[PDB]
Symmetry: D2
Subunit: 465 residues, 4 copies
């Protein structure tokens, strides 16, 4: 799948954190970066495709450490039934479309931390083999110990999908997301858990995410967290994940969940600063610093948060108040940080419901969510370069892919983006994409997605042959 | 549109109620009945297709006075969202499939008293023109003064679809069912109602059904009925319907509603015997007998009603108790009765939820509903011949189509069915279809529907190209 | 129960609409007004109690044409169960306390248009006989054709009390409000309705209120009104009310309901300008003018309405937008208008839930609601004198009590209030009460209610003997 | 506090499990047992009150290891609001009434494992001091880590009290049950949990019950259990409980919860056999046998469980199926068992809702619950003597009160009951009480409760002075 190209004469930001290098040239052959250096210092035979990066900035291909290519954030409110019913038969194409939408924003690698295993496998495999366009996918499959989209984990007091849908359909959806690893694992002794997780890991996942704490925030609010498992069952899960040799992700929503994750040396802790609206103790930050563990955080911009607060939004507490303070203090301490957003490609019927306030700097809008993330983190005092490293090298490191991707270095995959303006002068300039390259192949990124499916709109009631 | 055929040597039950005529032959040319006579009295040039009816019974094509080809009854519980979301783009084909399923049951003409106008129009016109297969369709479009499937008229206290769906989708679905004739009509002065119903009737409906009473039984139960309109607004609606020259249907759920419908000389009174679990007064029945108005009734069988009562079903009061007694008394009195069922082709995911008891002699299962109706009515004392007429000639008379269909008479359309066993001996023998003929064309009815859509099952999550 | 007193030397506003008379004296003997005229012109032997009305204004005792002394507005949202459970055993005392709270605001006569018959009878009879303090009560008992507080008439989609209370208690409350005249009347033929309403009227009510339209606004919103009865059953009810010789009240929520009420010559039409957010036609206003019928209207102040609109309040449409326009146009046409508010004495636990915006110029706060009403109507262009007549003579006339009360005239009951400042200069000066007299007895109105019950607060968990 | 009496000539079942000792006499002085011996071996100076026990059986005062004197089980369905609103002001008297109803059933000591702290304190102290009648009370106060009756811990998907009640009342009720030890504890670091539980234990509780697992079965069913706290927070709680010198109780709803409780050497494990409908592993039972820890279990009888299954009751899985099998296996293994029921004195309006089947051998009906427990356990194979010990000596042992009560031994409190029939011959004969003695004082137990409060019925709407 690799091709050959040269990105010529731009200011290079290679993702290793150093001072940027002007008039630099990147040379990619057969997918891989072979030469990085000064323009005058190396030659481009004109049988070779070139991009003119003069006056422009060269960055590695962007990396999102947490997306849902079947839109999971939606399923936690309105729209789950209609979306899943509408696209049954085509989930892998929904996933490919979402990957393409991510690619349209410069993101060449996505890490999907919750999805239905079958279609995300199909889509990853098709994208890897050139059979389909889109960002490179690595996935967890399901979240261990969490129920599917029609269980309590996606209910609200006034929103209970199972009251208005067939049990059969609901069960069929819950099964394709749970894959046998749902809430019932909490009823089992450790020796019955071990084989189930061992078998699950043999199914081909790139990493494993465990629900250390509950996923009941839609039902109970933010200040009543639980643990999904006893700690010895949790340790069973963790040990089997280590046996399988894949990275360990955690889902936590309390201070004690966070500490518990830290003491398991999690490779990546998803929304680590979501802590039941209780402030993270200095001790916990000191552990993150001593152990050099990666925390993913999911912030809101000043504007989005203010809008949320202005309408008493139900998820105003997800990133607001004490969690905002957590983000600020984590930044100021210099802990290892990873970009992730829970973003997905939201159904247009649900988008059409939304006010302009809801849409402006919306954190879950796949394709723009990473721009917004970097903006929000910089609004909280993060250094623009660190913010770029967060969306580039850091997730590669956390997921153990930094030998293949995440920085522009010889031997690594030729994923690259070119920006018209300086992202270190203004982080919103990350939006100023003009070229996108994946494995040395330049992408017509403005013409993505190739075959609109979810994003096809408006919708015709009776399509005539 | 029409073809030529002859049905030979069967006992004729012609639909006019007379003594059955043995060793009879029916001859059809270009869609029209040209000869009815004794067998040995008419030659069949044997280049002409023949059906050997010896030892068999010949009936007119069956007629159902009330169906919903988009399954409305379903939308009054679980399944509306998934069903409408899954088949958006294809509603007319859902309707054609249901029409074919009706045809598979011996029904050559269906009267649809609530549906979405655009797709039922498309389907009717394509079936009429030969572009699609199915029973002949006549329709009301919407019910004047009723809300769409995501309004109060389909809610239950613990079933509120709008709480878990996008407003945009809900609104789009309510608009294609309401077509501007929803609950808001109840807020208008008469002079502003007039143009809306005038314009509605210009959209090509075959008849018009008015909500004399409410449709809130799902929300409030059976003992709290309302009137939808004032008397003078009702005067406006009725006047405009009569001026458009189409039959007037009514929806009534109370004794006063029924009386109000009788006083307007309604052409057909849908579930006339549903009257708030209050018994129909003798004077009302005597009004029905004197004005000779058609009542559609929707009974349950003994087994079904008993299952319903056993599991304390929400709609046990639809046809149970006082409504059963109403049915019995209407039968004994000999009022004019019409077969109708509110049946539709139910989504297989919803059917798969059902127990054997729910499914057995289920009244809303399109394709078997009319058999079950006749069984149920004969269980209550109806004369089998009367029941057969209720499902052939009587609907045609009520809808003013008896000049074209509903009996086997010279000049009428050549819609015919053949049974292997005597329906007058045992009404369940209506199920023993061996031949079905529509407008002279014999139908391969065991092979319907042609292109399973709703009824395609099981459903595949990811269909590979 | 009458006593003797003289109100000396104040500017008299007698309620007949004329220019106010300065230096006037009102002389009451044994409950009745015996002399009204110039101060110099008549003598007060000093064995006689006097109030010094110098520099002050003399008005008749205030009259509220619509209250609920068991707080009905509350039962339509949160708090019904706890209130009714807390005060079972003492409803007549709740009612007396509320009457006393009305008296504290200058209101000497209240008309209660929905309540539980037994306790409102007990309280009226006790207040009339001196056994208990409070405003004079006249009542309807229940609203004919409406369900009790635990039926659909007080439900909202997210508020269903019967899901969390005993059926037994709920039924017991529904019975004491319905008194057999609930929703089931809609299921009956006219000849079965007649005796039930005839019997109900023999139970001792002062007037009868009929639910011409539905009471489902909490469940369905404002733009889906129904009629409770067929018009001939409605006419049965109306005729029996005329037979009984008591005033006819109507509840309407649509233009057609309003017209229907008008064509029955209703003595008082409660919230007549509540019309499904459709504008009242000129023709309907012309009928009100030609027939000189009384309309009660329930407006909001500019401030309260703005607050409601600022928080998307669920009952923002009760008096806002088109209904505001209705009020304005009714005022500008000069139709006969009556003050009423649906106000009650709200449980303090429910008041404690409320923001300051909700409480400021709240229309349903018994004891201040009439001040607010007059303010709101004057904000809409009503003449202050007409606004005073609306809360004084007009309800007396509508309910046919103007021969006994509602104006200061010889022969009438000696109900009087004294104000410190001029209500014709600023209508909020209606708040400046300094004396209150009922049947010639001066009231220590600042010390009401005598025996706090509902208003007793805070509430002690364990009261020790 | 104590009195003097003698019980003469009965078959003694003393609570220590030995062979029953015929023609025995028990002698009590100033509340204390001083003599147990053969009849003809001890003289009764006949100025001393006597109970003729000839032909009768003498048992220790019965003991219930788990009740709720404010009826908690009720609050998990319908009735919480009405019950708490109706009796605010009088909670301690509700508690005393329930204690008296326990006493009416032969129960002289009750252990209340969830209640509101203030009123249960008041009631315990007044019963202890002679100021009120009833069983001796020992209490936990609240359940550490559980929400109050208007939190998620008492919700069902279609039962959300807070949707129809004032926030103020709900909050006030949640505060008096939680006492600051609610769900928010799960958000805290260990060092901030420590002072709260330290201070909680200083408020005078007799023991402390910890929510090891969740209390969301009403909301999520039985197969989705969680842990309330991390291991180290649980360490803090347990450490502080042990340091306060009171018994440690646990609430567990999973196998891992049960194992976690066993590993902490809990003094009593409440509904130990409720384990997510997953069978208890043999190794857990063997742990119980080796550590000899007390398990409270809450079974259903055959009839009751069968009624429950017949009507598909929400709590059929509380004691049915795998939990029944757990009970059976625990009985066969001979683990230490304690009688407890979660029973309370249920509001008569709620009882009046119930069918005969619901009421028959109902496990939560205080005053009969312990009889039903013993019946249910003997139905599962328990030895009647063992069952009797489960309801006398065993709770006293688990709560560390066996030095004072639970057997008839010299030095212990003179709590005694007399039966007319042999409970070892048929366990239902535990119902044949003829005498009840508390601390030497014979109780007029047929005359309890003294002052019906909750149980006063029917309820009068308007009580005239
Ligand atoms: Co060269
Ligand atoms: Co912007
Ligand atoms: Co059958
Ligand atoms: Co004199
Ligand atoms: Co003010
Ligand atoms: Co029994």
């Amino acid at each position: 799948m690799g091709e050959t190209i040269a990105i010529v004469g731009g200011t290079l930001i290679d993702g290793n954190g150093g001072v940027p290098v002007p008039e630099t040239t990147v040379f990619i052959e057969d997918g891989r970066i072979t030469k990085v250096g000064s323009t005058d210092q190396i030659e481009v035979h004109p049988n070779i495709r070139q991009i003119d990066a003069q006056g422009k900035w060269i960055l590695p291909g962007l990396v999102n450490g947490n997306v849902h290519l079947l839109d999971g954030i939606m399923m936690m409110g309105r729209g789950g039934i209609e979306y899943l019913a509408r696209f049954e038969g085509n989930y892998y194409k929904v996933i490919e479309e979402a990957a393409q939408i991510a690619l349209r924003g410069g993101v060449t690698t996505v890490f999907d931390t919750w999805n239905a295993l079958e279609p995300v496998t199909i889509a990853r495999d098709r994208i890897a083999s050139g059979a389909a366009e889109g960002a490179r996918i690595f996935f967890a499959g399901t979240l261990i110990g969490m129920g599917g989209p029609f269980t309590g984990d996606f209910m609200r007091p006034s929103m209970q999908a199972r009251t208005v849908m067939s049990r059969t359909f609901a069960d069929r959806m819950d099964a394709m997301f749970e894959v046998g690893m749902g809430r019932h694992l909490s009823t089992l002794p450790p020796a019955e858990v071990r084989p189930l997780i061992r078998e699950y890991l043999e199914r081909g996942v790139d990493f494993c995410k465990i629900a250390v704490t509950d996923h009941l925030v839609g039902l109970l609010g933010f200040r009543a967290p639980y643990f999904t498992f006893s700690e010895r069952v949790l340790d069973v899960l963790v040990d089997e994940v280590r046996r399988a040799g894949v990275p360990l992700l955690t889902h936590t929503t309390s201070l004690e969940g966070l500490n518990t994750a830290i003491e398991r040396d999690a490779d990546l802790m998803i929304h680590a600063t979501m802590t039941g609206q209780a402030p993270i103790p200095e001790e916990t930050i000191e552990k993150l610093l001593e152990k050099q563990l990666w925390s993913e955080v999911q912030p809101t911009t000043i504007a989005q948060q203010a809008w949320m607060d202005s309408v008493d939004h139900p998820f105003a507490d997800f990133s607001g108040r004490v969690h905002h303070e957590n983000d600020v203090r984590m930044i100021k301490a210099g802990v290892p940080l990873v970009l992730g957003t829970d973003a997905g490609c939201t159904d247009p019927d649900i988008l059409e419901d939304m006010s302009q306030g809801e849409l402006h700097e919306r954190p879950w809008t796949l394709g723009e969510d990473h721009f917004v993330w970097m903006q929000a983190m910089v609004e909280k005092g993060m250094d623009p370069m660190a913010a770029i490293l967060a969306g580039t090298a850091n997730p590669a490191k956390a997921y153990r892919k930094f030998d293949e991707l995440g920085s522009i270095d010889v031997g690594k995959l030729g994923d690259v983006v070119v920006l018209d303006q300086d992202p270190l002068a203004d982080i919103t300039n990350m939006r100023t994409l003009s070229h996108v390259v994946k494995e040395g192949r330049e992408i017509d990124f403005h013409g993505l997605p190739l075959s609109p499916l979810v994003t096809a709109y408006p919708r015709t009631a009776n399509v005539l042959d």
